[PDB]
Structures are given as C-alpha cells and as structure tokens.
Protein: beta-glucosidase
Amino acid sequence: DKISHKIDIPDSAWTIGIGEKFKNAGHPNVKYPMIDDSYVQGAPLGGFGAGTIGRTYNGGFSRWHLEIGKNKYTTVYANQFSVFQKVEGNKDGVAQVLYAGEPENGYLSSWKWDYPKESGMYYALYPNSWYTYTNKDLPVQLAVKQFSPIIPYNYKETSYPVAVFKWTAYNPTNKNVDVSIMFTWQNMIGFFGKQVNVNSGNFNKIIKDKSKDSEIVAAVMGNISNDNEEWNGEYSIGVKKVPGVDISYKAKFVTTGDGSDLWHEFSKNGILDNKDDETPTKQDGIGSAIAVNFKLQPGQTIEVPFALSWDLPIMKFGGGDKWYKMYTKYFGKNGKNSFAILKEALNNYQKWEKMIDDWQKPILSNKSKPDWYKTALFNELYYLADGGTAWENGKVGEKRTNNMFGLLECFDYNYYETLDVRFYGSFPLVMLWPDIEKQVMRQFADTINVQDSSEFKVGSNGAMAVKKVQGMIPHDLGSSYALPWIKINAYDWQNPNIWKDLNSKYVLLVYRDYVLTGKTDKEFLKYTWKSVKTALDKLKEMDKDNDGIPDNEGIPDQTYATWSMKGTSAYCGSLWLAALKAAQEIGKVLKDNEAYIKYNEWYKIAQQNFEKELWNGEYYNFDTESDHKDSIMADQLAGQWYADILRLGDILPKDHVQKALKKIYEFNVMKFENGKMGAVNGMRPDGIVDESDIQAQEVWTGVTYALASFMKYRGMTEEAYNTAYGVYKMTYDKSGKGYWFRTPEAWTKDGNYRASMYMRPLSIWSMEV
Ligand SMILES: OC[C@H]1O[C@@H](O[C@@H]2[C@@H](O)[C@H](O)O[C@H](CO)[C@H]2O)[C@H](O)[C@@H](O)[C@@H]1O
Ligand SMILES: [Ca+2]
Structure:
C-alpha cells in the first residue's frame, strides 16, 4: 500500500476490506416483517432533502433513498468506476470494474467483474469516504475520496443532490504506465415513479463547458418529456480536465445488453469513441460513460475529480402531495439543471473539502478523546441525510417564508419527527443546523391546539380513540405513505393523546433550542410560549392523586409503551420536574410573572413528592404502583440529564443523582454481558435483567449514548466512555454485529436487533455539549 501515504485519511475512519465478508451479522429479533439489507453498506451521498444514494464498501450504488421516505436496496450494476492500465511497451493492458461482485443476471456480462479480495480498503468518516486500490495486477495504485458538501451552519450546499469523487493515482514502478478511469451511470429516470415503460423517452447527451480556467465534460441523462412529476428530471456524471489528462466519452450504451458496446472500447486502450447519440430509448435501459486517460511516469502522482448530480426536483408522498426539494431554491425547479449542479461541484469541491475539514478538525485534533469515539460521533451523522429526509421548497402548483423539514424515526416505523425519539436524536440539528431544528419545533408548536375528533382503531388492543386532542403534542408529523406535515399522528399502535412524556419533552426541547443557540432567541421563545403553557397545563390535569405529578396509568402512555408505568414514574416524573423548571425560566425571560409563580409552585410541590415517593437510598425506583416498581431503569433520570444540558441546575440532590448513575453503570451496564453492549433498559436489584417486557431486556442505542453524556456531565468520565464503547463496538467493530450505517434502535443480549436505520442514536452528539 503506497497510495495511503499520498492521501489524508483520518485514523478514526471506519475501515473494512473491499470484498470482505463478515461472519457475525445480526438479524431482526421480532416476528413481524422488518428491513434487513445486510452488512454491505457505506456512507451515503447527497444532501439534506435531496434524496440519498448509499454506495457500499464493495463499491456498488446499492442503497437508494431517492424516493423520499423509502428504502430500496438494489445494486444498479451499470453504476461503477472502472480502471484500465497498460505498462508502456506492452502489447495488452487490463481492464477491471472496481466492484467486489457481479450482476445476478446476464446484463453487462462482457465487463470484468469481481474486483478481487485483499486488494484495497474502504474508509469512512462521514461526510467523507474513501476507497484505495492496491492490486498485484494494477501497477498504478489508485484512491478516491468521495463526499457531499455536508457543512454545519450552511443551509445551501448541505441541500445539494451532488457527490464529488476526487481520484488520486500514483506510479510506484520504474516504467511509464497508461491509465484510464471511467465513470459509468445508468439513465435512472423511471427507476421509481413509473408504473410501465420505465425507460421510455430516456435520452442522454454530452455537455462540454470550456470557460478559459476550467474544461468540464459531462453526460446529462434525462427524458424527452417536460412533465413535472416526481419521476422526471436529470442525472449527470462528469469530470474536470486537469493538466496531463485527456477526456473521452460515450453518451449512450445499453444497460440491458451484454455491455460490449462500451467495454470493447475501454478494455482495448482506455479510450471511448466520443459518440454523442442523443436518440431516445423505448424499452432498453441506457447509460453514459465518462473516461479520463493519462500517462504516469515513475513516481508521478495525479489528481482528477469526477462528479455526480441528480436533479429530481419533486418529491411525492403516498397521499398525493407533491413538494419541491430544498436545493431547487438555488438551481431552479424545472428538472433541467443537473449540469449546473455538477459544474458548481467540479469548480468548488476544494473549498467544500476545506469547509468540511474546518468543522471536523477541532474534534479530530483533540487527542484526549479516543479514535473509536470519533468514528461513532461522525459516522452516526449518516442518518441526517439518509433518514428519508424531507425539506420542502413549496408545494407543486402553489412563494413561501419557511421551508418545512422532516427526518424519519426510521423506515420500518415510517413517521416524520417522532417527538419522543427526537428528544434524544435531534442533538446534531440543534448543535450544527439550528435553523432547521427551530423550524421543526415551530411545526410542533403549530399542532398543539389542533383537534381531530374522528376516531381511529388503536392497534395494540383494538379500542377506538380520538385522533388528536387539543393541547396534547402529537407523536409525529405524518408518514411518507400519507401526507407529511398535513396529517399528523400517523402512529396508531397506541394512543399518543394520553402519553405523559410528550408534552414535557416538547417543553424541554423548546428550552434546549434557546439555550444551545446562545440564549439570544427571544422570538423563538415568544413563538412557542402559548404552546408551552398549554402543554404543561393539560399534563397537570392528569395528576389524579394530587401529588403535583401526572399519573402513569398502568397502560401504554409513554415512549416505553409495553414496559408499562403506573403511579409516579422516575422517567415521566423527572421529565415533568425539568419541564416545569424550564417553563419557569422562559417565564422570567418573557416577563410572564404569573406563569413563573405558577410553574415555580407546581415545581416545588412535585419535586418534594418525587423525592419522597421514589428515592430508595441507592437509586430512584421505576415507579410507585407497578409489579416491577423497584427495577433499575437506565433512563430513570432523563429529566435531570436535560436539566444539566439546559443549565437548570439540580432538580434532584447531587448526591442522589450520583448514586443512581453509579448504580446504573454497576448494574445495567457492567452486569449486562460484561458491559460490552451498552445499558440494558431495566435491571432488577438482584442483578438479573427485568423480564416483565421485551423493552426492559433491550439496549436502546440512543438511550445509552444519552446516558453516557449524562455520566460525562457529572464527572463520571470513565463510566461514560465505557458505557458508550459497547454501542460503538456492536455497531462498528469486527467483534460486533455489523450495523455500520444502519444503527438500530435496539438489541437484545444475543446482539440481534430491532429497527435498523434509526434516529435515536444521533443522541451521541449530546456528548459534545
Ligand atoms: O422502540 C420504541 C418506539 O416504538 C415505536 O413504536 C412501534 C413499535 O415499537 C411497534 O412494534 O410497531 C409500531 C408500528 O408502526 C411502531 O410504531 C414508536 O413509534 C416510538 O414512539 C417508540 O419510541
Ligand atoms: Ca400524581
């Protein structure tokens, strides 16, 4: 490996061999159907709201999230980088597709498939990933750095449906070597959104742009139709000329054929025919090819950038709503702008690299923190772009002030912005993209007083219930199968209108967003104040025994639905105490003196009764009235965790918080599979896992990373990182269960999972507060 020294891969990058097999991969632990796309995954490409493309460590473009809110795992075999190499003076060279695999059927059979094992590595530190190619039969060694410009405090480039592929080639041998690199791409218009004649009208054309300082050559793959539908638009691939390379191209080859129309050209001398056949197709899949060829002298290095753009301006949801994607603000809405996006990328990618380096550097250069933590911290961010992210720039047919946003809970549980989950999972947004975070929270503020009196069938039991109650925060803001932002509370397995934790978490989130953006945004507090008071006032009504705290009802009425709570619980109780103190503070800031007095009085009463009812001398009991009431809950002090972040001080005694945390570490962590798998949710004081419900026996990834941050705030540094380590190990390490770039909600003791590709573990960013 002589190429690794020529490029700059951080030591914290997650790593795996190209073509490596993995023996210990987990699978779903539930009986109902659930996504399992295997461990062949990689860092996604594409901005927020653009639709994402998952290119795997084997090199294939395989995890497609271009249809917003859907996960489609299939390798489009025509989408590849390929290499040609011939030592100067030799009769023949070699051509090889850079993909550790081959097609299932007979299409593209003439191409050289099956990139061999132990001949390269994949690296990932999101938003960057890398492939190196160190192959006995390729004298020139190659590496590519691939990324999308995902940049904190940047709401423009971060939206772009674009990827850059910066290739570096180096000749360690004592002879001249001719090298070509070819990017192939299928015209994917009609890949989704067309019921019949999926390729019909598709056509490809070559664009050349030569404006003195920059020569760019591109293929634009679109359709003859000018219909404004979610299926229509353009894909583009291209390259920028550098000194000492030449560009060749082929606008049209057939993806539904043996591939020899392209390969007989490329495998001969690495130079394509330069034909621009713009003729539309009927039934055949078609594609485009862009190649660069150059001669490398001994010890010479060269750098050449390729790019990929996709202008698919319209997203459609199952209920019929069509919206424009965010990036259309900067490039237009007519779906004929793929080249413009590509060009911007090819002329600005160096600036984007240094912008990405600037926001990774403070963490990467802090040598007090171990590399494994940085691996998780950065790579967990995959989910912001990959989580079916919806970011609208107008409804199709309708200007606008605000641009609504939605990130999914996950793909299995297809709900936008599930509030109880985002309580943990929204840390990256508040810390790095706060305007998005504030917009999401204003969306929630606007739903508080919505009333929908029509009834729905509750799934868990069968009972009927009202859809949306006035003054109760919704579970979610809809589903991609229905109408995001318009039809809220898509979740129906329980009744969220009786939950005792959503209203509190809502309040805590509002105050969080004020505090972590510098305590300067009074206007955000004013926008949300009515909703905050309403939310706490309705929750106070659920105090049935008059201890000042809402009663859990021994039925599904919080996040841990099936692991029931009854009476005063540590979880809902602590969240309530923290929320009341939060509302106190907003009262002071806004000079709402009566609110302050009221929430102060409610707080003191509730605080005293919480302590008296739940403190047992070592920890806080799970609740007052359950069968499993003395179980040790990992999340028992969620309220105090948020209070630390919100700088609200001690809601419970320091000494008692410390003991409770030491108990959780000693029990839920250390006595669960030797602390190598995170914190199991519930442990009985005899040191045996609480078996009363499946959720109690689960490790929740995001709860565990949140728990770790809480320990870190309280000076338990060793305990924090040891707790987090088990989650890192399970996700990323060769000894874990192969969940890289699909971190699940949960696992049980056997390492098998529930709900891959989950929002909650983004809570790791709470460790950076
Ligand atoms: O894992 C906790 C989260 O669970 C989600 O609830 C449901 C599943 O637990 C259940 O098995 O199936 C339905 C199918 O739609 C899921 O919604 C909730 O959405 C989350 O609020 C909860 O935190
Ligand atoms: Ca009560």
About this structure: Residues 1-364 form one domain. The CA atoms of residues 460 and 533 lie 31 Å apart. The chain has two domains: 1-364, 365-769.
